[PDB]
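Minimal example, chain plus sodium ion.
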Amino acid sequence: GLVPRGSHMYASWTASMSDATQVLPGAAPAASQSFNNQTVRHVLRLSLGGNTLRVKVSNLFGKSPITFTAVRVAKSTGQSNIDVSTDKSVTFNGQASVTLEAGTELVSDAVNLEVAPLTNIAVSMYFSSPTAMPTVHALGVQTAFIGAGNQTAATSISAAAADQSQSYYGLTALEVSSIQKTNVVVTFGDAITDGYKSTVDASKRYPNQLDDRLKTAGFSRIGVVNQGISGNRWLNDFSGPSGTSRFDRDVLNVTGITHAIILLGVNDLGFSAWLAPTQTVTAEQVIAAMTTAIVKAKAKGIKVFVGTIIPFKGASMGYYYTDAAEAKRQTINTFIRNSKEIDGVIDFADALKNPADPLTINPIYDSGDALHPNDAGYEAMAAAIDLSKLQ
Ligand SMILES: [Cl-]
Ligand SMILES: [Cl-]
Ligand code: NA
Ligand code: NA
């Protein structure tokens, strides 16, 4: 019969936030990027369509307040171009401008813009004042366009190509409303979830390719959102907040989450040889962090899947990959494969390993650094997932 008409919001796109100024122990300080009477137009792919949308902006890692002078949305027509007939003001309690204190985030009012799954929209922000923006998604695998003055409603961004970025600035979620029964799959992890070495602007991250499989099978109401951070670790900050500290924000608190795919840990193992020798961790400490995250998500009724850690022999031998890192990887993967607490294993390691040597990534799936997959490898990761488990 008729689907009950109650409308609800669902996360359609996400980006986990990092503090661009945080550095490793013993490292030199790093400056945040700043805007000053400038517009940044972001482009993002929606996983879920629907009738209205809202934008979640962020000053989570600011050291002082920031003011979004204007925020607007429109359908993207490629590069920095928009369909101006779809341009809409994004308001916050009815106001076009909004100030976020340091450490806070805010979701906008609903915007009356009907949107379709697997389409791109542009989210444009104008900062009239000098604005430090340490709160970023560093590796967006997507071009952002920066121009002078308030260009938020302009058909394109007029500026030099050298001003472009591949980050997201203070933009962390896009939610879209629907009356339909809807699942939301959160992919949580590091660069291999984030999509590092997949083709920029091509939507070839593994969660994108999983999304493609779902829609091709007819499940337009099963969404996939990306909560990967390149360089992320379970147990220590950098790159990005530790996985254990961000799990509530980036997984449990995602609007409409029903399923989580967790793939995290290789950087806990790889960072201690050289990047961060004071942060050596054991497989047992990684397993303890995973355990607590699994317990919390299951207590919320979320279906929890854990991926095995993909082989990475050859990745900066002696300085990231080591015999100690491999032994920890083996222990962690054995724990994952035999766990009765999780709803299922996704054996990414088995799917991507080299038939000639299981400690290395399959050459056809290797971006070239022995650690990050290429587009074909991210396609193979998505192909290894049982879609009946996301129902
Ligand atoms: Cl307006
Ligand atoms: Cl690169
Ligand atoms: Na900060
Ligand atoms: Na959240």
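The longest helix spans residues 283-299. The pocket of sodium ion (ligand 4) is lined by residues 249, 253-254 (CB under 6 Å).
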